[PDB]
């Protein structure tokens, strides 16, 4: 990569949808050579794919939690553990980090009852689990994990 | 919203390149009927965008932090220091929350230099910050924000 | 339910003996009406019942306390752990809950020696308990659940 | 009071509606001797009213919370931050209490909402208040602060 | 008792060695009736015994600790603890607590290795222990639980 | 002191009432010896008096707490704070400790309103004070401050 | 550096005494050479000097202290407290950390007393310092700073 | 030792390079008798050694820990889980401690994948450990252990 892959990719990581012609147009550069450019960025992996933002609200996801977890230490815990929660219905985000707790994980449910019967009962009955301490999203301020370069 | 559109999200949120023609053989429905529902729900404001999936790797962000801010508290706190912590290049994501803490904060980094200088030193100065506690983030097990229907 | 039904509610919440008589001229509105709502929110059950408000303190209830439970997880304990507390003599409120504990428990009794007995040496050896923290009510500065309506 | 009258407030906690004759003939004294024990009940304080228990559900109040609060000492403070605690529409129990943390505020509201507009941004401005931390009550095992006798 | 009994015991609290023709004459009553109600008090109990107060610096006893306990929780868990921290030499103090931990234990030694080897190497083998958590007394501001009447 | 002493010392801090001719014929030397060994360690300081072992139930002191205390640093904080607490009447013990919390006070009072009159009442006013928290002592398993020589 | 220079490293973290003909004849090199490279690893950096390891028993240094530090947040509080944190005299160790607290501080004395002057009373005039919490060292198991190479 | 001792040591624990003329020049004694001196520290095991300080950074160890350690406890697992704690490569310190924690670690690698690598997940499969807590160090302020005197 260079200084003209992160011009690209500044622009694409809030409009994938934005021809080529107005892209090279604003970075001035050829079409063709954008294109290869872009080609290239796929195919080694900078660009993992293009999706479509969905409105959380649209699919009334209103109850929004960050559950931090404890672990019943084990050999490789982290990946056992960070694996079954992962696979949890409604889970987009688990993270294995450093602190008094073990694992942070980020998760979206339409209501209470459907976070308790397809979260909350399914994490108790993990072996690995010591225990949870969910944390409500009263309010979500900001979230533009899309946002790479600033 | 109907169950087609839900067809249609459930597709987009991971491939947005997909062309019409593929998207209208695997659902089942026209193609001109497929366009004037994705169309409509871009105006509804369910479709807000179409973003570019970038690998942090690719641009060494590897320094991965997950910060919990306790706050001073005072009228309005929750907007004034929610807005001050998102405007911090690095910071995707600020939650207001319920529990022992205030506000979770997501950002990523490309250094621990990096990370005191463009989030801790500035951070420090808030004054509506009482003081913060960082979780380092040793391995994303997960990370797909993108995907709203399971 | 409709305006009127709650106008209603309003007044049984704080005095279930008010005269037919009196709560018509009050809201205005035929007794007949008034006697007919008030049989259809029972019956519907809204109304689940009449209570009578009794002063603890003339009981002697000067143990009060609010007990949090941090429990050992396993698959339902929430409802075998919750029940379990809940049958406890002096108990009357059993809530799971969210955060670094999962159940909270509010209890009355006469004594420090009550409340270790019929409470503490219960709870002690129900094995889905971990371990619990009692918080002592100093005083009780506004304890009044009937109120549903402000 | 004595044991007879014990007897009829353990009924009574449980139906204020339940007839003079039907209480009577379970408890087997005369009718006569019984609304005048009920009465003297009543003039002594012992009774202090007579509500009716309405379900929370059919108000909608679903979203419901136990808040700790840290208050900034001084004197007197358990007064002052008490009563601006429990004027607060919504909120029905507030509690001085021994431990980490100063008061347990119990509220109810509809949803997330009403308590972020009418709890949260209410308490975030009382100058007594250090911070709060919030329980979400994910399901009401028991609620029945109205037994008083077991 | 009575209020010269209470008078008195306020004198003997600090004063053991007093003689009898002084007490009496400091408070003034004959000496026969002060020998016959100290005699009365120790018979009915009230005085449990005479301590002579030793300054524990004269025996080196410079290790001051305060030891919070959280248990592993089993039926009758707090006395049989509660008695194997008791009979640990060194241990003067043991209180069962409400709060975040189960025992408080008070103890005195003459250096870091004898509070290592006498209290930390038995507490650590005791099956009903959980954790300790020792809080070193850095200095006695006071320390006189002879005074029971202020 | 000798190893003499230090049996005299033994016994004196058990039973201060002990007839010098029966500590001389327990431990074998001459009376007169005795006294004098006893008088030398008044005069050194090593007794530094005699007092009444008072049972503190008879006074009705049944609301026992051990209080943590977090303070507000300042120059010289340890010993404006530490007598402003060694000062509340019913307050025996005060230390300045070594962990999360920087006094730990022991007090005794006849009731729950006593306490927070005479104790939380005066604290919540002191300006060195950032908060408590109380433990509230459920049973005194062992309270034998007066033997030092295990 | 090279492979070379990390064996000589290797060898020098733990005995700088050892002669030139010694480590050339260990490590199968010219000593013209093995001087030189050393000169070079000093000049470079790598090597910033010599020390003599001192047993700290000989020097009574028996009040081992690893203290947590919780700051006043504020612009540059991270350099100025962790530079007022560096100039006590036996503090030898201050690291700006992330987490629930903010430094760590290590530190060596002879005597609790003198930990108290020295440390303590420094420490709480400080006035960006909100509160610390300190943790005994009872026993060092290892204490090897000087091994950078395993 | 005596003040000799001391005046030489405190020029060794910074230079143990400096030329023996330099240092009798310094402290004003015979070059033999400083030889001597110095030959008996080392024989009475003042002196243990002499070591490099070899700069941390120039070997790329940017990721530094301080991790606390809760255990399980048994019989003497301070001095097993201590030893556990102390063969972990990069691991230089490890501390038996008072608090809520049991153990300190200090240690050092290059990289965020080394540290899980080496010693997370070493550490997890540890049958002695509860859990960990890692503080990650952002900045060293000071690390001069070498300093023993002031
Ligand atoms: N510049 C454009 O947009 C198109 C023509 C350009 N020369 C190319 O190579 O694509
Ligand atoms: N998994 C481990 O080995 C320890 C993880 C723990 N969260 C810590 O910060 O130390
Ligand atoms: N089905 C297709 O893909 C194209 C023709 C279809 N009848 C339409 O309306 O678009
Ligand atoms: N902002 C507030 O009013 C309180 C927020 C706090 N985190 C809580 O859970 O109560
Ligand atoms: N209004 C009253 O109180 C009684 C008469 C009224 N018309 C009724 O239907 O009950
Ligand atoms: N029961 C569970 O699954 C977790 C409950 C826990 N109190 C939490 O807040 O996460
Ligand atoms: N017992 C009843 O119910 C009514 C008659 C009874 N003798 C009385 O005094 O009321
Ligand atoms: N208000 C006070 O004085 C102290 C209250 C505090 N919650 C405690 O338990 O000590
Ligand atoms: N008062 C005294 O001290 C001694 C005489 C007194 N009358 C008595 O009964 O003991
Ligand atoms: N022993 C028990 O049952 C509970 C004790 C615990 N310390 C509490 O405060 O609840
Ligand atoms: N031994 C006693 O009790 C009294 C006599 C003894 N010879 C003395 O000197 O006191
Ligand atoms: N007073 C101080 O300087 C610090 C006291 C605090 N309790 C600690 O353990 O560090
Ligand atoms: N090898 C040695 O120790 C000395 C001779 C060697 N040729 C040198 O250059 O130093
Ligand atoms: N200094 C800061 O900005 C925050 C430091 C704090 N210890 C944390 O981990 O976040
Ligand atoms: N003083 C020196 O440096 C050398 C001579 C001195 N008289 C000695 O004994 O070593
Ligand atoms: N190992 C033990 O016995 C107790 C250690 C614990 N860290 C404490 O401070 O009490
Ligand atoms: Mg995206
Ligand atoms: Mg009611
Ligand atoms: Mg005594
Ligand atoms: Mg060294």
Same mark, same amino acid.
């Given at each position: 990569?260079?200084?003209? @892959?992160?011009? *690209?990719?500044? =622009?694409?990581?809030?409009?994938?949808?934005?021809?080529? @012609?107005?892209?090279?147009? #604003? =970075?001035?550069?050829?079409?063709?050579?954008?294109?290869?450019?872009?080609?290239?960025?796929?195919?080694?992996?900078? *660009?993992?794919?293009?999706?479509?933002?969905?409105?959380?609200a /649209?699919?009334?996801? @209103?109850?929004?939690?960050?559950?931090s $977890?404890?672990?019943?230490?084990?050999?490789?815990?982290?990946?056992?553990?960070?694996?079954?929660?992962?696979?949890?219905?409604?889970?987009?985000?688990?993270?294995?980090?450093?602190?008094?707790? @073990? +694992?942070?994980?980020?998760?979206?449910?339409?209501?209470?009852? #459907? +976070?308790? #019967?397809? +979260?909350? #009962?399914? $994490?108790? /009955?993990?072996?690995?689990?010591?225990?949870? /301490?969910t944390?409500?999203?009263?309010?979500? *301020?900001?979230? /533009?994990?899309?946002?790479?370069? +600033?």
């Amino acid at each position: 990569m260079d200084e003209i @892959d992160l011009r *690209i990719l500044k =622009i694409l990581q809030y409009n994938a949808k934005y021809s080529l @012609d107005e892209i090279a147009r #604003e =970075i001035r550069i050829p079409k063709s050579t954008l294109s290869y450019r872009i080609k290239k960025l796929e195919k080694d992996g900078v *660009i993992k794919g293009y999706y479509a933002y969905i409105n959380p609200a /649209s699919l009334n996801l @209103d109850y929004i939690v960050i559950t931090s $977890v404890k672990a019943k230490y084990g050999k490789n815990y982290h990946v056992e553990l960070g694996n079954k929660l992962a696979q949890i219905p409604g889970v987009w985000g688990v993270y294995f980090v450093l602190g008094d707790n @073990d +694992f942070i994980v980020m998760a979206r449910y339409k209501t209470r009852e #459907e +976070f308790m #019967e397809k +979260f909350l #009962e399914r $994490v108790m /009955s993990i072996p690995e689990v010591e225990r949870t /301490s969910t944390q409500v999203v009263v309010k979500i *301020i900001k979230e /533009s994990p899309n946002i790479v370069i +600033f």
